[PDB]
Ligand binder design. Sequence first.
Ligand SMILES: [Ca+2]
Lengths: 557, 208
Amino acid sequence: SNMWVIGKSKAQDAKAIMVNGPQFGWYAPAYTYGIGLHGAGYDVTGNTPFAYPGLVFGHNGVISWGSTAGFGDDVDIFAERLSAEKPGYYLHNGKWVKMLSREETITVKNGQAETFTVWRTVHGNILQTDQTTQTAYAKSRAWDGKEVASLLAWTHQMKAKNWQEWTQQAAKQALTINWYYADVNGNIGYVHTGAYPDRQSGHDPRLPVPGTGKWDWKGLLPFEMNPKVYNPQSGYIANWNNSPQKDYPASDLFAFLWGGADRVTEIDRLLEQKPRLTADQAWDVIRQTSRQDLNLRLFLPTLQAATSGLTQSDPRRQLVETLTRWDGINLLNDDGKTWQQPGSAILNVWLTSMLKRTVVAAVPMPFDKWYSASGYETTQDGPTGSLNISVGAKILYEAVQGDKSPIPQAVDLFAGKPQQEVVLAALEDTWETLSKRYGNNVSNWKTPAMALTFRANNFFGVPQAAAEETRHQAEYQNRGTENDMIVFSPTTSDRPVLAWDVVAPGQSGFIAPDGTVDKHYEDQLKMYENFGRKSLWLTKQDVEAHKESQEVLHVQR
Amino acid sequence: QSSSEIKIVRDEYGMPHIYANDTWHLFYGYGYVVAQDRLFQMEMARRSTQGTVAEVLGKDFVKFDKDIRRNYWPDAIRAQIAALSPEDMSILQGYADGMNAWIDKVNTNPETLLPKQFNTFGFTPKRWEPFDVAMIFVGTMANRFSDSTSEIDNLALLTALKDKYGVSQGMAVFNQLKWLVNPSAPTTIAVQESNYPLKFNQQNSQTA
Ligand SMILES: [Ca+2]
């Protein structure tokens, strides 16, 4: 998910601009749901995942808000001490404590039901047990007990009219989620929201802790600790699931890192290119980031240094020349199937070979597979989510930065060989692989473009529509599942707030019994592909002026 | 205006706007329009978030259902709902009650109102309660975007690195591949503004 919030000192023809692209994957019917709520203290418009009561993306005529997933480390695993003498008990603070348990029965269409037990300790549900070591692993979430409070925080924040009111609700949202604020006066703000544990001294949050009592969390850290900024001196707030703040630690997932190589830099380059950005320029950051190869900026300098003494006829140099002439923006040819430039395929093959030679070779099997991905992994339906720089590539980037990297290279990933030799060897592999598939004339290489699919199965892999409801888009775009933009105090209008979004395929998923799809079943699908957007209405007058239908209900609770 | 009245206006893209005079009525209108636009999607989201997919789709979803149920404690969610004030409860209750109003219409005239997908997949929709609404959020936001850990796998990687490199070098190579923090990471908040003031153990001292 990405977000850019442009404040008063960076906005052109407005006081603030918020552009959000939450990345949930692509589904039919739409992942998010458009809704306006007016009354009972609310006056809001926007769209939200699974029609939650709280709108994740929207505004109330005074402030606007949005989110990107935070990926802070809010989950630790406690290794519980079991005993074969006391089945169902664990040792905690010097006593054998009974675990909580429940039985569940899975009913099965056209099959036999299955019954199993779920077990829980003071540190959470049990994920797995090792009877050999008499250890059960319990998953502890800092937000445990605060699920409903977090849903409500997301609802009540919609009534906030200033930063103080909004942060009071941010402090109640317990999941690890980046929240963003903008308002009619041009203020902008950011909170890395959530509950985070106050860990004992010595607790390495990347690895399990004993569950016998000494390593239990002290409690939760205070809201003062959550990373936050209000009206940053830069004049903007940008995020693409990168680190909130210097010295803040990421999720403990082994394939997740915050390092020198980060896709958020592609947003910074576009926001810093010109002194100020209009709303149209802020919106156009979607299109450019959508099409940007994320590895070119990272590795092009290494490739150029490695090839700088080679002859004009050397294919390893010619592959780099091809990359040098490119800005990394992918564009479809007229076939709607191939990219105009072959650079992503060059980087994919090169990076795949480099990782095999470096990070992969340093890591014992079967852990090595964890580092072999190039970041160009997909499906025949195209990527299931965003594209990112792979974990292996981020580790390789540190190694190729040499003493510019702050990470100690405890093992030389080049195994004593000069980096240039390895870089050139991977370029020889690249030339062999690609020239065998396309021939020797790089100018005619028509490499396959990625596509995008609105899948009929939800993110869990569960049908939420019939298979034929799947929708296809030729151009994969590394962008929000929806995109929404809010403009504050525009000089081009007297309104305090203007806003737009796109919810594809459409607002409705309804198909009647006879197969007739609703009128709003697919009317945002072309707008999505073309980087278009529709106006979001807030006021009664604007709603009425754009009314298609109405219903009046009369109901007693 | 009356407290019983709910006005629903859809725009030119079908987006609904709810007008009501109290919390329950407002969320009732929201639930009602959700049930008109997205009933099948929401029913299947319910089943996904509670692990009741195999009931309608069969044996291929058994392991899925078990994994969902093993990852939450439903009675704890219900205790959180029981502790809500009347105003907060009204949000969840209104939402459920509005979906049910439409669901009941659907099930009374299924020949014109039942989404085709129910006929395709062979079942009919049942009513909702506040717990179901809460679990849509928990299962699709909390569990998707806030329940991420690989610590058991990390410890296996660390064990394998120590076997290959020795205790000290294995810990240092874990720090190279899975660093705690990396000061050159681009940060949403610039360093001039603030930095995080806590330092963390980076050598598995919990078992030293
Ligand atoms: Ca952890």
